[PDB]
Design a binder for this molecule. Sequence first.
Ligand SMILES: CC1=C(C/C=C(\C)CCC[C@H](C)CCC[C@H](C)CCCC(C)C)C(=O)c2ccccc2C1=O
Ligand code: SF4
Lengths: 738, 39, 202, 212
Amino acid sequence: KVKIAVDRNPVETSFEKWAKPGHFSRTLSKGPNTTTWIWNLHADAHDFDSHTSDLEEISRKVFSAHFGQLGIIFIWLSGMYFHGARFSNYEAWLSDPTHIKPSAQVVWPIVGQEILNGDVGGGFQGIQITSGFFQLWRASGITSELQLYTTAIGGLVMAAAMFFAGWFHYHKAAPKLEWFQNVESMLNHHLGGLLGLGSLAWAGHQIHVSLPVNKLLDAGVDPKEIPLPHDLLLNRAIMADLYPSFAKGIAPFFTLNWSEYSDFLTFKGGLNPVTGGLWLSDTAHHHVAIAVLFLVAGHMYRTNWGIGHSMKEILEAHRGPFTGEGHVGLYEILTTSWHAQLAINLALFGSLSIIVAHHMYAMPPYPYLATDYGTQLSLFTHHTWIGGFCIVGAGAHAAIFMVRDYDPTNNYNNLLDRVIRHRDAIISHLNWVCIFLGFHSFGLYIHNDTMSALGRPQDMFSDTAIQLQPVFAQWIQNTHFLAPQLTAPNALAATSLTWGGDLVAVGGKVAMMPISLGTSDFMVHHIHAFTIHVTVLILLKGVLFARSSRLIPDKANLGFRFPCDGPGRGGTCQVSAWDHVFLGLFWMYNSLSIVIFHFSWKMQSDVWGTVTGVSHITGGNFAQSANTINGWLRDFLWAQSSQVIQSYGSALSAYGLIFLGAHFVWAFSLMFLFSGRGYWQELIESIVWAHNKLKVAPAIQPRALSITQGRAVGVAHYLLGGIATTWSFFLARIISVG
Amino acid sequence: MKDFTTYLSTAPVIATIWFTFTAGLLIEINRYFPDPLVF
Amino acid sequence: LPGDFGFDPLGLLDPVNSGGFIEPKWLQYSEVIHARWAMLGAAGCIAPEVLGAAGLIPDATNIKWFESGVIPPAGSYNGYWADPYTIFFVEIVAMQFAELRRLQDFRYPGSMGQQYFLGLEAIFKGSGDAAYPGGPFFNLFNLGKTEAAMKELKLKEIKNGRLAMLAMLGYGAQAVMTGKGPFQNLVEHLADPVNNNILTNF
Amino acid sequence: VRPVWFPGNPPPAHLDGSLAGDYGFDPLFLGQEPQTLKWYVQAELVHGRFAMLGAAGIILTSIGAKVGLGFPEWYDAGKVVVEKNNIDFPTLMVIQFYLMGWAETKRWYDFKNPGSQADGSFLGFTEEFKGLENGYPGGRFFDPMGLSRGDAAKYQEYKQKEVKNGRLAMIACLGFAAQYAATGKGPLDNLADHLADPNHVNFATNGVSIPI
Ligand SMILES: CC1=C(C/C=C(\C)CCC[C@H](C)CCC[C@H](C)CCCC(C)C)C(=O)c2ccccc2C1=O
Ligand code: SF4
């Protein structure tokens, strides 16, 4: 029986514990004697499983935590809109999105940071934002910075509301466990309402606001000349002017004569050529379709009436012969472990964000977005990184669950059980396949460069030399090129030019063209594949042997994170799934760096540039330089390095600055990466002798970090330096050359 | 209230405020007296 | 209790684990509050139009209600002795006082009859029940000294109020669709129950 | 039982009604601490008396302005008088500094040490710098008319009236500041204006205060 179950005034409100460090945990509450006390205090502040054992209270904790998270995000978005409204040239760029660089950040006239307020057009002096807020707002049709002002204001209000919500739901009224567990109710609620309604309301805003105003934009009327949105809502006259279907209002919809509404629900495909954005009619049709889908979807499961479904029942039903108990008890599991749902959602979300970036560069929706090569690249790399990190966090919390909440007594012969059984054969096969992949895919490029230095290019692997043509990908490309003929009769254009076809040009810049695939691209795809397989390997090992191993039959007893079990029996160094996900971070960074390199170079070479033919940025050099790592390094890196290595005296000079600084910090990480906390504490003892020699010892006993903590500090700094170096390089290069 | 005073006498917030004070000192210094080299 | 036909499908009257303002007392309280409000709103919106229809009031009056100026885009009236915001200001402070002291009751019963309030404190003892103070003022005449007729009045109030809420909904919906007076729509659908309907207005 | 600043709710702990103007109003519990509270008492007294000064001088000068006496408008008056005279602004300021510093320092160290300022270490006077109460330095100098030393009841009533008129004077001088900040005119001018048309002379007519 699904209903509302809460507890009134559970938690009080006083700054008392605020004066009490470590109060949340048992041991830390005792106060600091040595320095690691503060570190661990911080480390465990949000480990609510460590805090206590009440599932319900932990649920309430994380609930308020989400509340506050949302509030933070509200704050950030609102401040963005605020600075967009106050310190931007967005209206100038509205008047001309073709020759004004989006800039929203101005600095102060001080010791010399002022030089950076460069010229982005329209007499504006600031920094080019690569975020694309300009094209975003134009697609949404925002015209007056007053609108952004209002927006930021409302965001402030929303954030305040969310934080009060967290406070109330934690201290005034906190729901109850069964209420948190009415899972099918939550699913139906979310699935239907949240998504369907959001999409449908966005479609309505589109239809009644953006499509008219963006239609007039591309019509060419002055921005400050269009009537107001609510005025448009008032006067159906002008709406029928734009599309006469509106003259009939809504009765046709009530007569199922949708055909008439086609004026604004098209199926053109492709971009608006005068704009480079997707066809807004098509966008609204997309979103309304998504809306109807999720709406009808949100009514699947039983909540308080006979109709519906039982997740448990169906999962138990689905069982195969080779599998024993099939999908039984998993209901029990998911109803119980927070980390399970966590890791699930994290992996899914990372994958999503990846797909998001993919389709986004594939078919840019925003006005004149494709022209902003820098914004494209930036958002793409951004979301790719975010997704990968979400993946590894998923692996992390999955292993966390397997350590903590696992119990054999309920899972007797399930998918999980047989997995635990034949894990060794599994991981073995995985090792073998990854080794083969690495060997072949790497040695290809290496043999190429070898024949090169050997003056036998005849014997390389090039699109001219011995070839590896992705016949599959090209065949599929042409397949999509020809699909609308028959497999999509009501289609006008393919969703992407890269299926084949012509080139679209807005302002000389190459907006989009069909892209071919050579043996070079073959090789790079196989590279990516091998790397990802290594990453999944290390993660899978960590999770599969987190609780035990033929080496450590009792590994489950050493907690999730733990330095080692000594140097005994050879040496137990780095034997935690914590260490495993650590290694995974490393290999992942490697993978995604490679992928973004591929993307950037292929874009610059065979896609981007300026139309006249195509003045490709690097003239397609990639096509013949990518087969050899020498060509790679020189023609990509060494070449595009100029922009960053001579950016001084310019507003972009900070790019080279942070370039060198990222170099610095990335090397700084390595001392942690290599050193030894024992040595460190020895130095500590020496220096405390030095201090006490002058009666200047601190009360809190200075202590070298735990092995784990040193590992973490080092890896954080390492990844930071690498990503920042690359980030700076990319930004400077593209701002200079695009 | 006293709880609040104690929370403010906690360490990292004090480090914070002292640093903010010093930094604002020096920034204003450079504002009103730009480009110092000697003396 | 009055107006209870067992009409609680989702079962919002569930007492266990209540709290906040999801709590039967405050709930029905707000119910009757909005119901009385809707009664007043029906009277307000309906009066001037039929009044001008009788011509007993001037034609400068009897503009359609929404054209008052509450939504200036929807149209405003002029001839008001002061500014819209001028009126609105004192209106705010007045209702602030009223609602505040009503709430002070609802949270602390009778607790507005002690601090000196110009002798109007016996008036502000009310009773041990929000939405039903009584007292010398809030019950001028002892109407319902018997509990049977008392609950009769209670049910009548409930039905009338809910119905008036529905009436306000109708007023808003029609005035949005046809953009005319509700009385206008009455005259229309009387001219044609056939040809003057929501089906016609498509 | 005493009329609360907010009827219905109970007063705070450190607020009881012992001092004049106590209506239980410390929604932020700033006076939870006795020392800080007493300090605040003295601070409120001082600031209210200053505001009384401010209002009185302002209203006098404004009358002298509106009626044809050639008195400048207060916010201009300092400049205009320093200009009409041969006085040196920094000299004025520094002498004023000397004086306020000495007297206020005496008051400060009396708050520190309640009675050390009447010891007679000063020239020859004793108990004539002895505070009767916190913020109440009732002596032969700060009460030559000796109101405090007769009818303590009417005296407490006077304390009530003092803090009352003091909060009134504070809000009044803030009001004057606002009137000028809005209209750029004399407060008495704006007064006569609201007299002319209360229906159409107000902040709502200014449109500045309320920005619609
Ligand atoms: C350098 C180093 C140390 C020594 C460095 C340590 C322990 C970190 C010291 C951090 C700070 C500097 C000490 C804390 C300072 C206090 C906050 C005191 C106030 C200081 C003010 C400036 C705020 C290790 O202990 C270690 C352990 C394991 C692997 C690698 C390493 C490692 O590389
Ligand atoms: S402290 Fe380091 S070296 Fe020593 S046993 Fe542990 S992991 Fe190995």
